[PDB]
């Protein structure tokens, strides 16, 4: 994995730069407060979207704004069983978005999972722990997808033998 540490470093530094947020009232609608990267009603409040890619398939998209940051991840999916496990695990978490609270209910078109960190989050939580968590998450969903692949294969071998051994 000569390419994993370098990749996670670039991604971490970008997130450190992007998570510099502040509370911001709406210039467009009176008494409304909204994440600018989502509504995008004021171009001057949106930062430049940047991408960090490890290879053609794995990458992270970071879209900043004055009071919010959208983070999208393209997860490593080597084969079919990995594609469906990832897609199931990602949906699993998104369905529990209200408890995750920094999770988007749907990913940005083209990615597997997206976070939506706001100034309210950076006010209540150490932004460096949030950066830590996004890196930890990227490493852990890959380990879990691998453990899941092993589990399914292992149980299938036993299921096939129990049936076959009974003839």
């Amino acid at each position: 994995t000569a390419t994993l540490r370098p990749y996670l470093s670039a991604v971490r530094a970008t997130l450190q730069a992007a998570l510099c947020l502040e509370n911001f009232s709406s210039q467009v609608v009176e008494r409304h407060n909204k994440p600018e990267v989502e509504v995008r009603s004021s171009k001057e409040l949106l930062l430049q979207p940047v991408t960090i890619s490890r290879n053609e398939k794995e990458k992270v998209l970071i879209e900043g704004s004055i009071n919010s940051v959208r983070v999208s991840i393209a997860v490593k999916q080597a084969d079919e069983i990995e594609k469906i496990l990832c897609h199931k695990f990602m949906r699993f978490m998104m369905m529990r978005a209200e408890n995750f609270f920094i999770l988007r209910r749907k990913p940005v078109e083209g990615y597997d999972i997206s976070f939506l960190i706001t100034n309210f989050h950076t006010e209540q939580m150490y932004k460096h722990k949030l950066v830590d968590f996004v890196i930890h998450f990227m490493e852990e969903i890959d380990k879990e997808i691998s453990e899941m692949k092993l589990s399914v294969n292992a149980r299938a071998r036993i299921v096939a033998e129990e049936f076959l051994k009974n003839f």
Binding site: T3, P6, T14, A18, R54, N55, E56
Partner: protein, 136 residues
């Protein structure tokens, strides 16, 4: 039901509105003679900052990317350290430009540039990649 379809904000007279490349041959010249650092500093010259065509900018990126890949891992720290702060910040911008075009494991060595470019410019240079209105 028809009239709520048009975005009237688009004509809000209170909105916000913001205010030709490196020498292709000069770069090749340096690259062909194996003078990498020279090729880098030459490619980081007169960037298509104020140009309107998305083609001119992509052309400039291609040249910069072509130089970055041509490098040898151990010869990255040296070249980066021969740039003035404004150079590093432009480099950083190009490094993030390349990430949008992975291929032949180009991203692998680009992550090496990003590492060194960061060690020289700090997170500040990445910040200046995000805040830019006129980009590469």
């Amino acid at each position: 039901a028809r009239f709520r379809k048009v975005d009237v904000g688009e004509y809000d007279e209170n909105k916000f509105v913001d205010e030709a490349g490196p020498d292709e041959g000069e770069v090749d010249s340096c690259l062909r003679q194996g003078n990498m650092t020279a090729a880098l500093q030459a490619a980081l010259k007169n960037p298509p900052i104020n140009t309107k065509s998305q083609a001119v900018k992509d052309r400039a990126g291609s040249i910069v990317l072509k130089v970055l890949i041509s490098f040898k891992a151990n010869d990255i720290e040296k070249a980066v350290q021969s740039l003035d702060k404004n150079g590093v910040d432009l480099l950083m911008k190009y490094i993030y430009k390349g990430f949008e075009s992975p291929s032949d494991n180009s991203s692998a060595v680009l992550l090496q540039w990003h590492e060194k470019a960061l060690a020289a410019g700090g997170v500040g240079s990445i910040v200046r990649v995000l805040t830019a209105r006129k980009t590469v």
